[PDB]
Each structure stands twice: as structure tokens, then as C-alpha cells.
Design a protein around this ligand. Structure first.
Ligand code: QTZ
Ligand code: MG
Ligand code: MG
Ligand code: MG
Ligand code: MG
Ligand code: MG
Ligand code: MG
Ligand code: MG
Ligand code: MG
Ligand code: MG
Ligand code: MG
Ligand code: MG
Ligand code: MG
Ligand code: MG
Ligand code: MG
Ligand code: MG
Ligand code: MG
Ligand code: MG
Ligand code: MG
Ligand code: MG
Ligand code: MG
Ligand code: MG
Ligand code: MG
Ligand code: MG
Ligand code: MG
Ligand code: MG
Ligand code: MG
Ligand code: MG
Ligand code: MG
Ligand code: MG
Ligand code: MG
Ligand code: MG
Ligand code: MG
Ligand code: MG
Ligand code: MG
Ligand code: MG
Ligand code: MG
Ligand code: MG
Ligand code: MG
Ligand code: MG
Ligand code: MG
Ligand code: MG
Ligand code: MG
Ligand code: MG
Ligand code: MG
Ligand code: MG
Ligand code: MG
Ligand code: MG
Ligand code: MG
Ligand code: MG
Ligand code: MG
Ligand code: MG
Ligand code: MG
Ligand code: MG
Ligand code: MG
Ligand code: MG
Ligand code: MG
Ligand code: MG
Ligand code: MG
Ligand code: MG
Ligand code: MG
Ligand code: MG
Ligand code: MG
Ligand code: MG
Ligand code: MG
Ligand code: MG
Ligand code: MG
Ligand code: MG
Ligand code: MG
Ligand code: MG
Ligand code: MG
Ligand code: MG
Ligand code: MG
Ligand code: MG
Lengths: 61, 93, 74, 110
RNA sequence: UUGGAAACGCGACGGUGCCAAGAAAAGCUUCUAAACGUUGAAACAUGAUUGCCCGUACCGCAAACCGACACAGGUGUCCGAG
RNA sequence: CCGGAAGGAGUGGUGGAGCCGACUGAAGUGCGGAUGCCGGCAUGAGUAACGAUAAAAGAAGUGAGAAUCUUCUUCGCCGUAAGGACAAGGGUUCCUGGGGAAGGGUCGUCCGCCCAGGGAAAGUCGGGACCUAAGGUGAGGCCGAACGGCGCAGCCGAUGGACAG
RNA sequence: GGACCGAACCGGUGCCUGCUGAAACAGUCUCGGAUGAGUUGUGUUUAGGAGUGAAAAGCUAACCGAACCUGGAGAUAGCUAG
RNA sequence: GCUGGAGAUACGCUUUGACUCGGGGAUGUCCGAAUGGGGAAACCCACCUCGUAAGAGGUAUCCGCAAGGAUGGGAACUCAGGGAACUGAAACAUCUCAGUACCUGAAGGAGAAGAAAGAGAAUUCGAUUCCGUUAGUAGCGGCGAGCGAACCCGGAUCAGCCCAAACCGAAACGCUUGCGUUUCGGGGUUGUAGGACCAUCAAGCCGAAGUGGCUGGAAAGCUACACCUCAGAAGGUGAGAGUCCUGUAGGCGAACGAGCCUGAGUAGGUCGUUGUUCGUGAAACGAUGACUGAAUCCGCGCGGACCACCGCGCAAGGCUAAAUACUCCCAGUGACCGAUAGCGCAUAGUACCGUGAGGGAAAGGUGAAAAGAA
């Protein structure tokens, strides 16, 4: 997951953001049948931002 | 980014039966300048918007017993796009 | 603040008004009518040290500054 | 509010294990550990049973029924067995699963 | 439609008299300093894109505001026909 | 029942998990009073009152239940108001669908009450990204046991100026 | 025109009524002013031995010859209760 | 196993080690010292740079060249500037309450003070602080009410160290010519006068020993035999368990985390005052606000007017652990409380009252197990 380029960090961040907003639309419809999918996308965004921070501090020193 | 500013669509007899006129209507982050929610809905649904109007809206209830209540606030937008521009199946409702 | 430059906060001290006025000189003694607080202050000249300045000065400061600069000077 | 279990939130047995009640009714009875609840100290077993008349909510059942279901206990079913009765037990050694300790009383393993 | 009435509103920054003698600052219209410009300026016209933030519900002479009350009290302005 | 007193025991009833007796020691140790304190319950008494002397009547409807809710037709009362539009202030009281314990001076199927859902849209109206008044504040500056007090430019400040339906 | 009558408005003259009120200052009736020393909104400034006051020791957030709150503080109580 | 209190259904996560615990990192909107500017706290308006925008960073004053430092907060404690009255004196002025209350400033985990120009009457001691004691002594006092030391002696703790100056080498700016004001090394730091210059604790793991019968709804109780004990502290479990559970008796334990000179506007003095037992008293001494104003080793301060003698010290420069205080916080304990008690609160500074500062409640209990009554 760290292997990706940071341009792919932006892409795979934005895809989770879009899916998260789509899950929200659904849930506001009331038909949110898979609640765990939300938290899964959120933690995935968390891991993504954290790994990019680790490539921040790493290398440049 | 766009996606998290747009919040969740309105659901009512009004905004739905106003979906048929070509208007679309949904909640957003209260801190959100009109032009931002315009660009966000535009580049989330691939439509060009020629009209927006925005209103801040504040609720408040109270769960039984001592607990005072006070539901959280928000803001709502209504948009009108160019005649053909009507948004897709997520407008399908 | 009245603080002088290498000077003086200006102190307080109760002022005593005594009456009988005949202590060691052969007499009954010396009663006291009242004490009450007081203070003071003092003068205001102007001299400089780095580039330019104008400060408060006491008579002790005017006296010491004629003997020599110290730090600030006329 | 009274606080929970004082047993350092430590169950003395897994949900897998066979076990026997050693007190109250059901003393001597045995079964598999269908539910362990360490922090509340509670143990599901096929021993104790109770007829719970769930109140009718028409939730597929207009008129309600009476289910037969087992009602949990705690650190009163005794731990694992081996010479056919409850036992004190001790930490052991390494196995082919050498990252593990097992158990024993005056005997083997569990 | 015809006839009539009429404002404290409009024409207004009208008239006349009076003494106790009746804000400021920006927008605004003129002038130049400085600067760029003096081939490509001002301004005009036509088309286009552009239009941010907050307030708008309801009570509001009162049962929804101040009066411990679904209180004979109090509450600034505006319209208020025959 | 017992002891001279403060008091003590027997027995039976409740109750559901801690407790007598003796000796010694330590006390926040003994209540009728304090217009004492907190709390509970009485009397006055089914009494006074039900909050403007602007009246109300019948039919029909709904409902477990109606003098009081809805509908119809009449009646009476305000009409420089007891109509209407705002600012202040209040804070969802607005609309729909339900409810009926408690609030409502009676009732209640109703409500400004309880529950849930919706409703609030501005380039042009008011304010802000414009302006300044009283007043406030204020680098520098003038004072002052401390904290602090003043004070030019400047800045803030509508109750006013400017401004496109 | 610190002129007259008189609504609004500001006020509070005499009587009654109210007195566990409709209201901790009111109501009906009556009465004073009503272009002025007038009435009123918003903003703002002055306070405790201090402010204000066409002057009553009035007013200074419902009882002001010295406000409220906290504190010194369990003030002191030759007095009364218990 | 987990999926916070929460007592709730659904979606699920977890031997690839979740959850919980110990330790580090990273993210951390807006307000608040708040600090780009304004502002009615959490809001309204900008400008500069980087960026494809989205986004990121900077923009307060005050010390500094600069690194860097300061704004604010903190229960009680510490120091400091300022500083009451009620009250006692059976009235009240001095006096007392009392340098108490309170305000303000500065700081830390403590602070303050501190290394004799002293204490004191033995030619004794030897920084400071705190405790005991002297001692209600000596004293102060409308000699009234009342206030009140210190030395010696016993203990806790105990260290003393650095500067300016004579004299060398400048170097810059000082002047009629091998010198003199602020700087930088050396040098030099005092009274029985010296220096000069010259002969373990954090997470945690391991841990001994009981079975039968009996009353019971249920056993830990009764009873019969039996065991451990460096472990009989304690809680839990259907009523009271050494041996059923959890257990410092004992034992082990981490990545990596805490612990010639010697001080001048000075000493001294006069005027106004004050601390100390010190109320003007014969009033020394310290401390000062105004004015004045010296000596320096046959030198200067002190020994309670003052003088001589005798005796104790070396001011006018700085730093300084520990014995001391306090309890926001944590652990253990109690002839403390146990629901009108105990904090105000079995939790809430809430509800409620006040424009505000501010004030401010009561309130506990199914059962062993929800088996919570189809
Ligand atoms: C009747 C009107 C008021 O009473 C009086 O004036 C007087 C009543 C007594 C006769 C008198 O007694 C007498 O004293 C004498 C010294 C001695 C004599 N002895 C010989 C017996 C004795 O008889 C007093 C002191 C007795 C005492 C209990 C008292 O202080 C009562 C106070 C107030 O409640 C009463 C009122 O009724 C309240 O009426 C108010 O009027 C306002 C205008 C209203 O706005 C309203 O205020 C909102 C309203 O309510 C407050
Ligand atoms: Mg529009
Ligand atoms: Mg005095
Ligand atoms: Mg201007
Ligand atoms: Mg409207
Ligand atoms: Mg509103
Ligand atoms: Mg009313
Ligand atoms: Mg009026
Ligand atoms: Mg008219
Ligand atoms: Mg008319
Ligand atoms: Mg008896
Ligand atoms: Mg029991
Ligand atoms: Mg008592
Ligand atoms: Mg009594
Ligand atoms: Mg008695
Ligand atoms: Mg009572
Ligand atoms: Mg009445
Ligand atoms: Mg019927
Ligand atoms: Mg009817
Ligand atoms: Mg009626
Ligand atoms: Mg009606
Ligand atoms: Mg009909
Ligand atoms: Mg009206
Ligand atoms: Mg409003
Ligand atoms: Mg309604
Ligand atoms: Mg009812
Ligand atoms: Mg109900
Ligand atoms: Mg009723
Ligand atoms: Mg009734
Ligand atoms: Mg309704
Ligand atoms: Mg708007
Ligand atoms: Mg301005
Ligand atoms: Mg001005
Ligand atoms: Mg000022
Ligand atoms: Mg000014
Ligand atoms: Mg305006
Ligand atoms: Mg306009
Ligand atoms: Mg405007
Ligand atoms: Mg339009
Ligand atoms: Mg007139
Ligand atoms: Mg009057
Ligand atoms: Mg009137
Ligand atoms: Mg008349
Ligand atoms: Mg007249
Ligand atoms: Mg006076
Ligand atoms: Mg008053
Ligand atoms: Mg009040
Ligand atoms: Mg008084
Ligand atoms: Mg008292
Ligand atoms: Mg006192
Ligand atoms: Mg007295
Ligand atoms: Mg739970
Ligand atoms: Mg700011
Ligand atoms: Mg900054
Ligand atoms: Mg600021
Ligand atoms: Mg003093
Ligand atoms: Mg006295
Ligand atoms: Mg302080
Ligand atoms: Mg501080
Ligand atoms: Mg000693
Ligand atoms: Mg036994
Ligand atoms: Mg002197
Ligand atoms: Mg003197
Ligand atoms: Mg005297
Ligand atoms: Mg002497
Ligand atoms: Mg002296
Ligand atoms: Mg002597
Ligand atoms: Mg010396
Ligand atoms: Mg007790
Ligand atoms: Mg209590
Ligand atoms: Mg009670
Ligand atoms: Mg209130
Ligand atoms: Mg309030
Ligand atoms: Mg329970």
C-alpha cells in the first residue's frame, strides 16, 4: 500500500472520498445495508494519509 | 476536496417533486461559500450550474429525561442547471 | 512612575503629631494626637546615554552626574 | 455503581472448553462453553436452562411465544476437567505449538 | 365611462416670515504632482462569463416580548375604508 | 412479666443477613420547647376562587367518552381595532401526520402542550466586504506605590450618509 | 404665541372599587398638559460617601439619611430566647 | 475475544494476534496570552510566497546582530509594593486587633535567607534556615488592656565558592613628547589582615493445598476423615471457603521508558519616620524620603546617650544545594461518615434564582440469576 506513488496517493484517496459520499447518500435514503463499509473507507483514508506522512519524514530527514 | 463538502441530498415531498422541474436540492457544510458548493456539485456530477441559492438551518430536540437536547445545525443548497444538464441516476429517486 | 534613572521609587511613612512637648526637659511627658501615612517624590531633568534620551532625575542624580558620567550623561 | 467483576477481568477458561458446574443447581453438570464474558464474568453453557417468554412484538410473531434458552452463569461452573471432575490447574510447557503453554492439574493437558 | 373629493405622498433642494441660528465623512464632479502613455489611450456600443458572507419560518398591543401565570399592566415606527 | 429509676427480659407477628451478653477504653451520647432546622401530613373546607357583564343558540359530524373538538346556519363584540405591516425580544412556538400522562384555572377527541417528518432560497430589500457622530480605542507621546489614568493621527462605532427591480 | 378647546401621546387631580388584587401601585369614572422649559426610539457616558437631582434625603434594577455581591466573619452582643 | 457508559437491533473485525494495558510518532477545525486586521469569545475582512488549482506556509508587540527569550495559566505554599475595620481597652483618641483580611506584582516545585564591618561578655562562637529550650524570663506598655525577645544549651541539615582593585600584554582614541577614562586574557580574592612588587520504579507472567455425607432454594455453614503454609492480606462465588476463582509469601520481567591596592554621592550627620522586646523614652543600631557629606592601616564599623580603655568585625560586588512550607494530583491507612451523615454533589456548580458579581438544591436499594411476567 506504501509502494504507490503520491499521485496514486491522491487518486486512491479521492476514490475513497467519492465512495464515502456515495455511501452517505445511500444511508440518507435509509438503504445503507453495509454500515461497516463506511468505517472501512475511513480507516483506509487514515492509513493513506499516515503513510504519506511517513514518506514525508523519511528520506528528507 | 469536492466530495465531502456536499453532504447528503434533501428528501421531502418538495425537493423531490422539484427534482422534476430540473432543480436539485441537498445539504452541505455550513461553512461553504456558494461558489464552492457550486463547483463541488458541478465536478461531482459533470453538470454546469447556472443557479444556486443557500440557507442556514438549525434544529433542536431533547432525549427523555434530564438530557437537554440541541440537535446540530446545517446549511442547504438548491441548484438549477442548464436545460439539458439534469443529473443522472443519483437523481433517479 | 516617578522612578528615577538609577533612582528612587519614592517612599511612604506615617507622620506623627505629638502634643505635650516636654519629654526629657522636666515635664510630665508627651502625648500623641495621631499618625497618618504620607509619601514624597522628586525632580525632572533630561540627559542621554546611547543615542538620545530624556529622563527623570533626583537631586542626587544631578549631583552624581557632575562628578562623572556613570552610565547616562548630560 | 457497584463496579464490575474483581477477578482482574480474567476468565479461567476459553469458549472452546468443556466444564462442569460445581455449585447450586446443576452442580456436577457438564458442557461446552458457548459464551465467555470476562469483563462481566459470565459463562454460557448447555447446562442451565430457562423458559424466556419474549413479549409479543409481532416481529414476525404477533402473539408471542416462550423460547427455551440457556441462561448464563459465572466462575461457578468449575474450570476444565480430566479425571472426570473439576480441578485446580497449572501453567505448563512448550509443545509443537511451542509459543503456547497448556494446562494440567495432577495429570496431563486439556 | 362621465362627474366630484383629497394627503403628512410626489413635483421640490418652491415661497414667505422667525431667531433660540439649525452634524461629519465617503461615494460624487472638477485640478494637477508622480507614473505609464504618447502605432496599441479615455469613453461608447454589442456579445459573453461573473455576482461572496450574514438576516428571511412563526409570535410580534401579545397566550409566542418584560411582568414567577395562557396575568385587565407595560412595549418604538408604519398603514388604518364607509 | 421483671428491677428502686433510668430500663430490661419472655413469647408471638414481620423481616430477610448480620448480631446479643460481660470487662475495659473513647465519645458528634440521651430533646417538647429555641416566632428553632429539613421533610412529611393535617385544620380552615368540599369553603373562597376559576382572572374583565363583548352574550350565545340549534342542527350535523367524530369518539371508549363532548356544554367545551370539527362542519353548517343564525346571534352578539371590536373596527385609528379587539384589522394589518414592521423593529426589539423570543427560539421551531410555523406546516403535515399522529398523541392525550402531565401544563390548560372545568372538560378535552383540542392546543402556543408530547412525538416524528418537512418548511426557511436574494447581484438589486436590511447589514457586511463603504462612510463618518456621541462614545470607545489608541504605535509614537503625557502622567502614575502597583494594577493603572490620559492622549494627536489613525481605527471601531447607526440611531444618520451612500447605493442597481 | 413657555396663547385657547381638544384626540393621539405625556401625566396622575377627587371619589369609589380593589387590599390572600386582574395588578408587590392597578381599574372605571373625573381631571392636568397637549409647538413646548414638549413627547419617544436607538447608540452611549456619570456610582457608593460616589453619581445624579426645576430639590423629596428623591432616584441609583420592586423597602437607599448612604446600593448589591463576596469576603474580615463564628464581627460584638452587660440583651431575649433555648 | 471485541464491537465505549448504553442496559439497542443491524454491519462486522480478530491466531496473519484483534481488544485491553505500558511507550513513542503522526494527525489535531474555530475561540482563548491569541498574536495578519476587526470583533458583541468561538466570528467578519485581507495582504505576501509556493501550488495545475485544491491545498500549505508567513504576516502582534518587547529584549536582542543572532541563537534565542518574554506575554498567559496554576489549589495552598514563597517573596515583595500597598494595606483595613469590626473588635479589646467593659466609653475613646495613644494602644489593640495586625502587618491579620484584601488588592497588586514576581517565581518555583518550593521559595526566602546565607558565608560576620555579626552574636556576645567566655580574649567563647563561627554561613543560612527549621525544630526543642531558655521563657511568659529580659523587656515594651494611656507602665492600662495587653504585647514579648535573644544569648548559652539539645537536635534536622550541613558546602562554601566566584568578582572590582593595585601589577603585566595590548588596541582605539586621549592629550606636547616612554601616560588614562571602558573593554580582553593573565594575577589576584582576605581580619590570627591577605594580595600586590622586590630577595530501584512503570505493562505483566509464575505461583501450595479437600473430597464424602447432612440441613438448604442455593453452602463457603454442620459433620467425617485429609492436605498446604515464606502463601491465614483481601475481595469474589445462591449464607460465613486457608486448599473453587481472582491474590507479593516468594520468584522472574521488556522493546525500550522514567529516575602602592581592598567596593563611594558610599559611612557619618541634620530634618520627617520606621523595624527589632524598642509607644521619643537617657534611644544605640539598622532602614531610609529632603539636604548634605570621610577616611583608608600607627585605617574604618561595632559593643544600647556619651568618653577613655578593653574587646568583636572589614560595609559600600555577585552566586549557592540540603534540613523548611503547601496539597490540584497519586497510594496506603482510620475506637471518621454511611443517604437530613459524609464534599455542595453516591455526582451537578447541573436544575433553579439573579442584568450581573453571585447564590445553588434533593435525589440510592427487584432478584443470587431477568429467568423482567408468553
Ligand atoms: C391595608 C393596606 C396594607 O396595610 C396597611 O397599610 C396597614 C395595615 C395595618 C393596619 C398596620 O397595623 C398597625 O400598625 C400600627 C403601628 C399599630 C396597630 N396596632 C395598634 C394594632 C396596627 O394595627 C400594619 C403595620 C400591620 C402589618 C401587618 C403590616 O405591615 C402590613 C402590611 C401590608 O400588607 C398590608 C396592606 O394590606 C398591603 O396593602 C398594600 O397596599 C399597597 C398600596 C398596594 O400597592 C399593595 O402593595 C403591592 C398592597 O399589598 C402590599
Ligand atoms: Mg438565485
Ligand atoms: Mg489606629
Ligand atoms: Mg477616512
Ligand atoms: Mg414572514
Ligand atoms: Mg429566526
Ligand atoms: Mg395580557
Ligand atoms: Mg406608549
Ligand atoms: Mg385616514
Ligand atoms: Mg372613519
Ligand atoms: Mg420492651
Ligand atoms: Mg439473602
Ligand atoms: Mg449533641
Ligand atoms: Mg419541635
Ligand atoms: Mg425544657
Ligand atoms: Mg414545616
Ligand atoms: Mg376576580
Ligand atoms: Mg358513533
Ligand atoms: Mg356548539
Ligand atoms: Mg363559552
Ligand atoms: Mg373554539
Ligand atoms: Mg354539513
Ligand atoms: Mg394589530
Ligand atoms: Mg429576531
Ligand atoms: Mg398550530
Ligand atoms: Mg387529558
Ligand atoms: Mg405519553
Ligand atoms: Mg385538565
Ligand atoms: Mg376536570
Ligand atoms: Mg397538531
Ligand atoms: Mg441569503
Ligand atoms: Mg471608519
Ligand atoms: Mg472622532
Ligand atoms: Mg483611553
Ligand atoms: Mg478621542
Ligand atoms: Mg441604519
Ligand atoms: Mg438601494
Ligand atoms: Mg446597504
Ligand atoms: Mg431575479
Ligand atoms: Mg399651549
Ligand atoms: Mg412624575
Ligand atoms: Mg396612563
Ligand atoms: Mg382645563
Ligand atoms: Mg393651560
Ligand atoms: Mg459626601
Ligand atoms: Mg427602588
Ligand atoms: Mg425580580
Ligand atoms: Mg444599610
Ligand atoms: Mg453572630
Ligand atoms: Mg475578627
Ligand atoms: Mg459594640
Ligand atoms: Mg454491556
Ligand atoms: Mg485574532
Ligand atoms: Mg506569529
Ligand atoms: Mg487583538
Ligand atoms: Mg508598609
Ligand atoms: Mg471597646
Ligand atoms: Mg497573591
Ligand atoms: Mg505568573
Ligand atoms: Mg545549635
Ligand atoms: Mg471445609
Ligand atoms: Mg547613613
Ligand atoms: Mg532619625
Ligand atoms: Mg506614649
Ligand atoms: Mg557608637
Ligand atoms: Mg543610623
Ligand atoms: Mg557599651
Ligand atoms: Mg572592605
Ligand atoms: Mg457507622
Ligand atoms: Mg447529602
Ligand atoms: Mg432523605
Ligand atoms: Mg432568570
Ligand atoms: Mg440566567
Ligand atoms: Mg441489581
Amino acid at each position: 500500500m506504501r509502494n504507490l506513488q503520491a499521485t496514486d496517493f491522491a487518486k486512491e484517496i479521492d476514490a475513497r472520498k467519492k465512495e464515502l459520499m456515495e455511501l452517505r447518500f445511500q444511508a440518507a435514503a435509509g438503504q445503507l445495508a453495509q454500515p461497516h463499509r463506511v468505517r472501512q473507507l475511513r480507516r483506509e483514508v487514515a492509513q493513506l494519509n499516515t503513510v504519506k506522512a511517513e514518506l514525508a519524514r523519511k528520506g528528507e530527514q | 476536496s469536492h466530495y465531502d463538502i456536499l453532504q447528503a441530498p434533501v428528501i421531502s415531498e418538495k425537493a423531490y417533486s422539484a427534482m422534476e422541474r430540473g432543480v436539485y436540492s441537498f445539504w452541505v457544510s455550513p461553512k461553504a461559500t456558494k461558489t464552492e458548493i457550486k463547483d463541488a456539485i458541478q465536478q461531482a456530477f459533470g453538470v454546469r450550474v447556472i443557479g444556486i441559492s443557500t440557507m442556514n438551518v438549525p434544529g433542536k430536540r431533547k432525549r427523555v429525561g434530564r438530557f437537554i437536547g440541541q440537535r446540530n445545525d446545517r446549511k442547504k443548497a438548491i441548484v438549477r442547471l442548464a436545460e439539458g444538464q439534469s443529473i443522472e441516476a443519483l437523481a433517479g429517486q | 512612575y516617578l522612578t528615577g534613572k538609577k533612582n528612587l521609587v519614592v517612599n511612604s511613612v506615617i507622620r506623627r503629631g505629638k502634643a505635650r512637648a516636654d519629654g526629657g526637659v522636666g515635664r510630665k511627658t508627651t502625648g500623641i494626637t495621631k499618625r497618618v501615612q504620607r509619601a514624597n517624590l522628586h525632580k525632572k531633568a533630561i540627559r542621554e546615554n546611547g543615542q538620545v534620551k530624556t529622563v527623570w532625575l533626583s537631586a542626587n542624580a544631578l549631583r552624581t552626574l557632575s562628578k562623572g558620567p556613570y552610565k547616562g550623561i548630560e | 455503581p457497584s463496579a464490575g467483576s474483581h477477578h482482574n477481568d480474567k476468565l479461567h477458561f476459553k469458549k472452546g472448553d468443556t466444564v462442569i458446574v460445581l455449585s447450586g443447581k446443576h452442580k456436577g453438570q457438564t458442557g461446552k462453553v458457548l459464551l465467555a464474558l470476562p469483563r462481566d464474568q459470565k459463562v454460557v453453557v448447555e447446562g442451565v436452562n430457562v423458559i424466556t417468554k419474549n413479549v409479543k412484538p409481532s416481529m414476525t410473531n404477533p402473539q408471542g411465544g416462550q423460547e427455551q434458552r440457556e441462561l448464563a452463569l459465572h466462575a461457578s461452573k468449575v474450570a476444565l476437567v480430566d479425571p472426570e471432575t473439576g480441578k485446580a490447574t497449572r501453567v505448563r510447557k512448550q509443545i509443537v505449538d511451542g509459543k503456547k503453554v497448556r494446562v494440567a492439574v495432577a495429570s496431563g493437558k486439556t
